[PDB]
Amino acid sequence: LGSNTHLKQLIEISHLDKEIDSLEPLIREKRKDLDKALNDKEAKNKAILNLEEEKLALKLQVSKNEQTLQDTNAKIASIQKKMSEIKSERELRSLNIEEDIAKERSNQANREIENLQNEIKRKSEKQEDLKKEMLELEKLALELESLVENEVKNIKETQQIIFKKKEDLVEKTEPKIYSFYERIRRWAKNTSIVTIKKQACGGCFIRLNDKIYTEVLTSGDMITCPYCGRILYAEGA
Numbered sequence: 001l002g003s004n005t006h007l008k009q010l011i012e013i014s015h016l017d018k019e020i021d022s023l024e025p026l027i028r029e030k031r032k033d034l035d036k037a038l039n040d041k042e043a044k045n046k047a048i049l050n051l052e053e054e055k056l057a058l059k060l061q062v063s064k065n066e067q068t069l070q071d072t073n074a075k076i077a078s079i080q081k082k083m084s085e086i087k088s089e090r091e092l093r094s095l096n097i098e099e100d101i102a103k104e105r106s107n108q109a110n111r112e113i114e115n116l117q118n119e120i121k122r123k124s125e126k127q128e129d130l131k132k133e134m135l136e137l138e139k140l141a142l143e144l145e146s147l148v149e150n151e152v153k154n155i156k157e158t159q160q161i162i163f164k165k166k167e168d169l170v171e172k173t174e175p176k177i178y179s180f181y182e183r184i185r186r187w188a189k190n191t192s193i194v195t196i197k198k199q200a201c202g203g204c205f206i207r208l209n210d211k212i213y214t215e216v217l218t219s220g221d222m223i224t225c226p227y228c229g230r231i232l233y234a235e236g237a
């Protein structure tokens, strides 16, 4: 089926595969502060541009309010002109009140415009803030980058050395045995070879029946789990 020396050979290889893989989180850890700075800087850059779209919409409102304020003031002017020419003096008190409503609407527009302009200003202040933060983050990225990339390069060279060792080991392995390993590794990755714990597959955790548990411990072969297909071994048999 396999044989214990073939099992040994695959255990050595599978450990070198795990080494190559488990160094991937290491590269990520090494980059964490640097990637954080770069990603925060990009997020703040987007926030500046978003705030610019909001300032644009607000500036459109300022302009719309400004047109109605122009209309309102023309109406005031027109009411006052009518008061000058008058007619009688029924309407002097009447027009004073017409004018008063129009004055109030013009006071509302002036307040609304001032309010919008205030919101615009707060956004421009926030933009200046973000811009300063972006520069601190660039300063940060530039500091971290020299070492981080050297550290990562040294780690890559280690994965190559590990792979070179794998080549040497694979070259000494019965091609059929290796391929049986690789076929399972396609889907199972680094849970390809597992130990028995309790009486269950160390990979799918479903209890192995008496016949199979005995077979793994007693016989000098290499057995696969009947539920998931993984290679199984007793840590010492």
Ligand SMILES: [Mg+2]
Pocket (backbone or CB within 6 Å): 096
């Ligand atoms: Mg008056």
Ligand SMILES: [Zn+2]
Pocket (backbone or CB within 6 Å): 201, 202, 203, 204, 205, 206, 225, 226, 227, 228, 229, 230
């Ligand atoms: Zn299993």
